[PDB]
């Protein structure tokens, strides 16, 4: 995309901590940038929309190349962050409102480095990543997500010279779902064969998808939470078409370059329904804030080893809370993501181990070694109504069959039109982000 001249781009300042030992950290003066999908797209030498509602203008965008020549994405000024997009920062806390009323629904954002010209790339192997979260106002159907993806640090600017904005304009998004709803891919409008998504007034799908590796630290609302590894072959940003995208709609979910299911550790799905929930007698009380700690263990305990284990623990009101465990007869009580856990649990659930097909923890680790961009988002799910996270999936499945039940939400929950009314004022908060060696962040 070209860059427009109507509004300066002003990312929100967000300090994080880089740590060397427990309680010995230094501030890193980073910032938050809005994903290019949420930006106004208009004519390069005017005010005329190139995209309105869920459609590209066919006169301006008869082809992707012409669209890209004629159109530009514009900046987010400071005033518009809260007023238009529902984003705000207080000290080291970042807040994202779900619906902001001209009416904005959801948000996806990235962490910029201290220069505000590149994404802050995190080399996560043999490191610990930690943050405080509040998901108390997110119920069934919503997801306040924090995760990493194998985006380029410059959003693709060096690879795709028609991308003028780079990381500064939140470009280059890709993930392990190979999404077609990304409006700008490889420096070009994804306007070919663009199709609105029914019941989604703001979104559509273009000819291409954009694939890359994804490490989900946090997919969650107050009812259920998960962390998940998604390797791809290769891991780096890859525009896809046809079978390579692994499109759900053509029966290709397991035929593409990315592991779409991922290998998940989701406490409720692993059959501990009392670990996490909205109340003081759950082990971890989702009505109150808490700290989420993630440790990325290698084979030799060094930065050069292969990724072998994703460990997790929590801190809430000064109380250390170890992760829940897998709880099925004849299955080891795993409390972390490893290749063995993935094989054993997917075996039990009858899920295809595409994680293993894509190179497993080792391949996931190669993405983490090269460095990944931090994503913070809030969203509802127009495909599957978040049932995969917090309900029975498939909805018609027996909840006593291992793998089906992922949370207590009813299978009628999560319809975007309903959650966008009922949960309009939901806000996820991510704060006090800390990064360092294992054992350094609490």
**Beta strand pairing call for 263-265 and 87-90:** unpaired
Three-class secondary structure of residue 324 per DSSP: coil
Torsion of CA 315, 321, 323, 329, to 10 degrees: -160
One-character DSSP codes across 230-289: E-BSS-S-EEE-GGGG--TTTT-TTTSSB-SS-EEE-TTTTT-TTSEESSTTSSEETTS-
- In the chain the first and final C-alpha atoms are separated, in Å, by 41
Phi, psi of 315, deg, nearest 5: -130, 125
Token pair recorded at residue 81: 């962050």
Signed CA dihedral, 67, 69, 71, 75: sign only: positive
Asked if 213 and 230 count as a contact pair (C-beta separation under 8 A), the reply is yes
Q: In the block, which residue shows the tokens 């995969």? A: 388
C-alpha–C-alpha distance, residues 410 and 417, integer Å: 16
C-alpha–C-alpha distance, residues 394 and 388, integer Å: 8
C-alpha–C-alpha distance, residues 320 and 442, integer Å: 10
Token pair recorded at residue 101: 């009323």
3-state DSSP helix/strand/coil percent for the chain, to nearest 5? Answer: 15, 35, 50
- Measured from the Cβ of residue 101, the count of other Cβ atoms closer than 10 Å reads 11
Q: In the block, which residue shows the tokens 């994703």? A: 310
Torsion of CA 232, 238, 241, 245, to 10 degrees: 20
Active site residues: 214, 219
Three-class secondary structure of residue 364 per DSSP: helix
Phi, psi of 229, deg, nearest 5: -105, 135
Residues facing 15 on adjacent strands:
29
User: Using DSSP, how many helices (H) and how many strands (E) does the chain show?
Assistant: 7, 31
Task: Identify the helix (H) or strand (E) that includes residue 79.
Answer: helix 78-83
C-alpha–C-alpha distance, residues 74 and 96, integer Å: 20
């Amino acid at each position: 995309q070209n860059v427009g001249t109507q509004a300066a781009e002003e990312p929100l300042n967000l300090p994080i901590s880089v740590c060397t030992a427990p309680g010995n950290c230094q501030t890193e003066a980073d910032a938050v940038v809005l994903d290019s999908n949420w930006r106004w797209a208009h004519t390069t030498t005017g005010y005329t929309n190139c995209y309105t509602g869920n459609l590209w203008d066919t006169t301006l965008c008869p082809t992707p190349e012409t669209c890209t020549t004629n159109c530009a994405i514009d900046g987010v000024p400071l005033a518009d962050w809260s007023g238009t997009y529902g984003g705000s920062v207080t000290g080291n806390k970042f807040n994202l409102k779900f619906v902001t009323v001209s009416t904005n629904i959801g948000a996806r954002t990235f962490l910029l480095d201290s220069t505000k010209t590149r994404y802050r790339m995190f080399q996560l192997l043999n490191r610990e990543f930690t943050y405080d979260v509040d998901v108390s106002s997110l119920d069934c159907g919503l997801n306040g997500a924090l995760y990493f993806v194998s985006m380029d640090a410059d959003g693709g600017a060096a690879k795709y010279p028609t991308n003028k904005g780079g990381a500064k304009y939140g470009t280059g998004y890709c993930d392990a779902q190979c999404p077609h709803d990304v409006k700008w891919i490889n420096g070009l409008a994804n306007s070919k064969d663009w199709t609105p998504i029914p019941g989604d007034a703001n979104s559509g799908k273009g000819y291409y998808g954009n694939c890359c590796a994804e490490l989900d630290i946090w997919e969650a609302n107050k009812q259920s939470q998960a962390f998940t590894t998604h390797p791809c072959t290769p891991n780096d940003q890859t525009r896809c078409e046809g079978v390579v995208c692994g499109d759900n709609d053509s029966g290709d979910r397991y035929n593409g370059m990315c592991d779409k299911d991922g290998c998940d550790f989701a406490s409720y799905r692993m059959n501990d329904h009392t670990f996490y929930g909205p109340g003081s007698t759950f082990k971890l009380d989702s009505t109150k804030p808490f700290t989420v700690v993630s440790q990325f263990i290698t084979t030799d305990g060094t930065d050069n080893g292969d990724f072998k284990e994703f460990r997790r623990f929590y801190v809430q009101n000064g109380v250390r809370i170890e992760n829940s465990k897998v709880n099925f007869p004849g299955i080891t009580a795993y409390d972390s993501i490893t290749d063995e856990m993935c094989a054993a649990t997917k075996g039990l659930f009858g899920d295809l181990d595409d994680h293993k097909n894509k190179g497993g923890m080792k391949q996931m680790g190669e993405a983490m070694r090269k460095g990944m961009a931090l994503v913070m988002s809030i969203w509802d799910d127009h495909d599957v109504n978040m049932l995969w996270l917090d309900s029975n999936y498939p909805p018609t499945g027996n909840p006593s069959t291992p793998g089906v039940a992922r949370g207590p939400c009813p299978t009628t929950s999560g319809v975007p039109s309903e959650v966008e009314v009922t949960q309009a004022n939901a806000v996820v908060s991510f704060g006090n982000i800390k990064f360092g060696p294992i054992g350094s962040t609490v």
